[PDB]
Subunit: 548 residues, 3 copies
């Protein structure tokens, strides 16, 4: 009939260039060649389908719709339904096997994509259609929904061979309790994971080999059965330089993070553990940074450390430099106020409003600064030079008052091998002064061996005459020193109670050393009774200084 | 016919399957059924429009253009013009009400989208078409432009019920000065806000309820009239675990951030306040981390604190661990060098090149470490054990010289209940030594009650005989101690100037304690005149040590 | 003609509205006007091409495909091939010159885009099609590939006038060794750079003018010939407020980052230098934050500092608050344990497991806290008040034992201008006690001038009578003090060995001061021989305290 348009191929006809007819299925074809006698139903040489996007043009750019359709390709291009029912695993696989697709796999605008079989990403990363809250509202708008009841997924990871990107993604496992379905495997060398929400699964993120240049941020990781993030490191490569920031772990049956082996130089900050059964676990944690942690409640456990390091002396070199909030059963081995152990401390510096402290793994030494002052873990505080080769004494300066202008006066002490003093100053008369801790030394004829202080001993020279003298090898001297002789015990060690009167005489180092330069090797003590006869105490003390 | 193609529906004709005719509007329809006698102008059963994307195919994928058009949906799909003039609010609303759209609302590639009415996002997040600089160049390429002169927006927020995402967005309010138009309301529980530029508005980001798992980064927030970020928390839920990083606040008439109530465990880092009239304000700030801030100039105010906490003793537990640059009127209550108050300190640890300090809110105690040493806020420095149950003394070790090999020699002190000494060593003779601070105790017959030092007092036993003895309950002993008797004041308290000679006798703890083991309870002092008769001074001093 | 559809324009025909004919090229046109007699081959007024996307509709939205094609525009829209061979520079330029394109330039889904000529971005930012690993696998899926052998690119930057965004991008330079081809120029004021991988180039990122509000994160920067990031700052604006996080610099022939001039208030964290020939270099680094750095191996250099600051005293105010790992030749001038210099220190606070320290650029002073205690860089440790106007003494409290309940007993010391003591307590008898460091002062008639301690000196008054007296301006007093007179040197400075007996008498400040209130100005010492005659020693010591 001439009242509608419809012509099928006729073998008797010669079709000119640009002639249009219908294929037997009704689709229109256009001849691209002169003298066309080929049947387009069996042989499309010399014909094009007019309803193809390669034959549709955007006049704004003078290009085909075919070209425009290369701007963004998703799993929907390969037949994914995203309908919450149909298995889309074959469409996901076809995307990853395609020659047309780029670095990443993309989801379409709206969809709940069911997966019932493992997808091999073939090195492609994963970009979703939104990072949603943990609710059906968001799952229905955009997510990957792994069917954990699928026999082909039991004990397996849903996505393998992930590229260096996981982002902008909501992913859940439905009906997988007890089936050990993990979400994704990604290599530890070079990754950017950000803005993800993962729900259920056994291990949510499975890291292959070891971390290096691995960046993980802004993740809501809810209801994992074993771990949020799991790194086996089967070859013991040793993980390094991983960052873990802004991660919310909630209501996991296991740990937040499990490293079977060793972690060096990694950074963890702004992490939340809410009703988990474990925090971060590793064999070794070395030279890592830890910032703020908020640890609130345990799922079924009664007590757990926020950081658990299993190796002996294998937690060391760390920076615990943010406040760790502990509520509802969480504990810490990293608090500045924690007492040190002789070994197996969690080694590092700890800085928060609780205190500023520093400790090593394999020793009791620990220093803590608080608003009130200092605390030590080994009953000892050292003061020395930063340089190990410097061998001068130190000087301590301490505020003791005001000068004449009203400014703080800091007085200087002395602590050398030969002198212990504390300085002062009289600003009324403008004179320096000092308080002294003298050397004290006692003679006692009942001693088995003479008492020695700092290379000096007291010996009897003759009746009533005692030398406070230098022993062999003592080349130190007294310079203009102060001398006080103590009280004699006469007749016996207990004493009779009788008294005696003393005088002194200096012992020079060389002729005139004392007379001219007030240098002495020591001094003699002479003891006399009330008749002025020389007499021998059983015991007496002397006190002296080696400087003025 | 005959020289062009055009056939309208004719009720006398039976249209076979695949027949094509034109609707009365000129659009071509194709029959999908045999024996078609239905008028496609009134009833499209058995017909399809050939210019629909459901009838156009991409042969590369063997799918319709309709499917490909599900890859990315924007407000442009719902009639938004983005032309800088036409109100697009209805198109934005239709997007949010549509069954076809995903987690987020998207803008088209290019457009300045005018909004004159409030949009209810219905839980969808917001993704823009670029995070631009603050200039018309970027607004013209891609932004949301809220008409602040619109009566329907006065006193209201432009977008309500935002989902968990705001990203890649430029948004401004035009002609809204004095109209109190705010930009967006987002729930505090689970948010990722990043790469945004917001210009004008009253409150730019309005947080509903309280922060928890709320992450905010990389934002240029210019010219707000009240606040960049405002959290009312009307139910006093208490905000936690919010992160605020890489935010540039510039030329706001009010504050950068206002929390009407309480914030716990939040992190703030790499924040700039340039010509604002306020920094961060809250009622309570507890266990929060603060990193680097650059605060330069105030808009109209003369002086403002970078952090303003209004509650009494409600700033505590914090980490102020980055440098805060203060220029042009900004002040700080968190500097390490700030003197402590007896109460209402901004409590926390403060660490920067200005000093390392720690302070609590409700107490004067504060410790500060600087290159020169230490400073205290309460005129006191404590030194004790980390363990509160340990009750041993401490030992301090201090460099005083070199050993014979040239290495540093650290000498040990003694400070027990019974002994105060400073150790030394003579490496020439290989002898230890010590400097002493003895107990001193004075007898004075004019005292109302005897002087007591450490459980010892001096009493007259008989003429010229005095006991330096233990009082009731003092079970401590002298072991091989040093004894020095001081100078007598004879005849009166002032003294006559006459002298006397002393001797001592030990007082044993048990028979033979001193003679055999040099243990004593105390000692007697005997005083005699020049004729060797026992005499009584009015006043005299003794000095002794309880150890050698 | 009757068995197919084909009709060309015929000037004898009047075409009704909706009539369809073919253009001479075979494309169908439809008349949009009644009585159409215009030839569509020369004049398209009154006609539309039916295969244009402006004539194709998505019935789901009731809009044209033309509108949908505004959702995402890429370089593919302007003829870019992304085929690894064809120069796409003209297509990139057309995109940037187009009225249709938004804030940023976008790549299509898949392609290796060759550029042989410089592209002027015209203020558009750059968004790629993935941030890949450093391998051909990823370059083939999606990258920009700059032809470094192109003569038009020698010595030039490939992209100029970049907008505020660079993201989600992989870019390499092929065959550019020795040709000094740099990648991109971007203004320092307001930038967000994230998730990029850059390979080869001379300078990878060229920052124009100076940093301010410049945010750079998550970047793998491999094989640069001069620098990963270069900032000349030709006008000396001074760079501020830049953030550099999560950057992996690997196998560069030059530095990671070069600032020719000054940097203030910038933040660097989680940075890796692997086999580079330099770290960060700048003229001045002021008030910057440095976090974790992992520096492992040098490419050809033997030794390099991770941070190199060239100006004298131009590294100051900084926070070195993360661990810096140094392996294979990297060195540091920022370690807490490094000895201080008199000048040119890298000034700042340094906090890690190595120690907690603080130092200024232009002074030797440095304090270090370690597990064992403290170390100083200038042989001095100060203890004072935080307030510069407070002029009271300090009290130190130190654990010395236990009280009767078994709690720690902290004893208090005394260090004033007039007194030095250490407190103790006897919990058996419940008595306070103290250890004393007295003032010591010696008389010697051979001194050129009298010895003075704290405003007191000893003068001869008459035969055998000596005054321990206040000098002019000393208004301080003795209150209930302890007095010990030392041993006399008789006859000469050396001493004869004869002795003498002393007594004392107080010198009052006013009549009755000592007798009634135990206040004294000083005291007299009287010396007598065995016949009780007054005698003059040549030299003697006194020790006394100004308080009890």
């Amino acid at each position: 009939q001439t009242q509608y348009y419809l012509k099928y191929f006729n073998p008797e006809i010669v079709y000119p260039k640009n002639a249009r007819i219908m294929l037997d299925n009704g689709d229109i074809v256009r001849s691209t060649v002169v003298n066309n006698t080929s049947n387009p139903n069996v042989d499309m040489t010399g014909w094009v389908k007019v309803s193809s996007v390669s034959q549709i043009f955007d006049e704004t750019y003078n290009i085909t719709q075919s070209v425009i359709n290369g701007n963004l390709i998703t799993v929907d291009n390969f037949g994914a339904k995203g309908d919450g029912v149909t298995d889309d695993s074959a469409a996901f696989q076809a995307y990853c096997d395609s020659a047309l697709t780029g670095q990443n796999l993309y989801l379409g605008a709206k969809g709940r994509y069911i997966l019932k079989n493992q997808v091999d990403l073939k090195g492609k990363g994963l970009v979703g259609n939104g990072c949603g809250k943990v609710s059906e509202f968001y799952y229905n708008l955009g997510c990957i929904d792994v069917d954990g009841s699928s026999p082909d997924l039991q004990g397996k990871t849903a996505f393998i061979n992930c590229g260096p990107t996981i982002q902008n993604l909501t992913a859940r496992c439905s009906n997988g309790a007890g089936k050990q379905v993990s979400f994704i495997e990604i290599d530890g060398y070079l990754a950017n994971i950000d803005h993800i929400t993962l729900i259920n699964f056994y291990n949510q993120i499975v890291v292959k080999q070891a971390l290096v240049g691995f960046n993980f941020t802004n993740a809501w990781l809810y209801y994992s059965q074993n771990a949020g993030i799991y790194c086996e490191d089967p070859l013991n490569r040793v993980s390094t330089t991983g960052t873990f920031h802004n991660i919310y772990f909630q209501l996991g049956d296991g740990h937040a993070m499990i490293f079977d082996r060793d972690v060096h130089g990694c950074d963890f900050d702004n992490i939340i553990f809410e009703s988990m059964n474990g925090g971060i676990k590793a064999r070794t944690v070395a030279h890592c940074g830890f910032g703020k942690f908020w640890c609130e409640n345990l799922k079924t456990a009664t007590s757990k450390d926020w950081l658990e390091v299993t190796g002996a002396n294998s937690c060391y070199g760390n920076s615990f430099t943010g406040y760790v909030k502990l509520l509802g059963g969480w504990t810490s081995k990293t608090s500045p106020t924690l007492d040190s152990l002789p070994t197996n401390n969690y080694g590092g510096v700890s800085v928060s409003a609780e205190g500023i402290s520093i400790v090593n793994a394999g020793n009791k030494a620990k220093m803590l600064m608080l608003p009130s002052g200092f605390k030590t873990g080994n009953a000892t505080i050292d003061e020395t030079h930063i340089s190990s080769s410097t061998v001068t004494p130190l000087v301590k300066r301490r505020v003791i008052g005001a000068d004449s202008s009203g400014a703080q006066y800091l007085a200087s002490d002395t602590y050398t091998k030969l002198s212990r003093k504390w300085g002062t100053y009289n600003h009324g008369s403008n004179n320096a002064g000092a308080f002294y801790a003298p050397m004290m030394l006692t003679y006692d004829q009942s001693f088995s061996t003479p008492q020695n202080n700092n290379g000096w001993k007291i010996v009897k020279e003759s009746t009533g005459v005692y030398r406070v003298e230098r022993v062999s090898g003592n080349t130190s001297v007294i310079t203009n020193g102060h001398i006080v002789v103590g009280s004699p015990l006469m007749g016996s060690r207990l004493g009779t109670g009788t008294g005696a009167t003393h005088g002194i005489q200096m012992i020079e180092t060389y002729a005139g050393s004392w007379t001219s330069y007030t240098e002495a090797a020591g001094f003699k003590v002479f003891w006399r009774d009330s008749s002025n006869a020389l007499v021998d105490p059983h015991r007496f003390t002397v006190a002296f200084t080696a400087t003025s």
